[PDB]
């Protein structure tokens, strides 16, 4: 209690900071597999530098890279089946995550 209570509340603060750090590591993994796909499989014109110069949010950059990768690898029939529509312009989200997972499977089997 008292002194030790406030120090253990600071410990709870440490727990919160560790949770934030783990969330950042998850961001690292996701966004980083996305960036590796983007560099390895997409044109230099879609680089983060030039897109930021054109003035796009980084989330917009990631979703654009994901959509381009899905169009490049995943077939149109698979897009029309999983995403239920041909156009990917409004399919950003969990369905986009499934599509990019399918694209990763496609490139793995392509190699």
């Amino acid at each position: 209690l008292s002194i030790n209570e406030r120090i253990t509340k600071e410990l709870a603060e440490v727990e919160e900071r560790e949770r934030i750090e783990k969330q950042l590591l998850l961001e690292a993994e996701r966004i980083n597999e996305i960036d590796t796909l983007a560099k390895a499989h997409l044109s230099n014109h879609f680089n983060k530098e030039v897109l930021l110069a054109k003035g796009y949010t980084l989330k917009d950059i990631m979703q654009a890279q994901r959509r381009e990768l899905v169009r490049k690898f995943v077939p149109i029939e698979q897009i029309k089946a999983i995403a239920k529509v041909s156009d990917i312009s409004h399919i950003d989200g969990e369905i986009l995550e499934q599509l990019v997972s399918l694209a990763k499977v496609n490139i793995k089997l392509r190699k």
Partner: peptide
């Protein structure tokens, strides 16, 4: 943006280099 062996595979949608 593909390797020399990937030329055999077809292309669905891409922006040429």
């Amino acid at each position: 943006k593909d390797t020399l062996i990937d030329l055999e595979q077809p292309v669905n949608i891409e922006l040429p280099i």
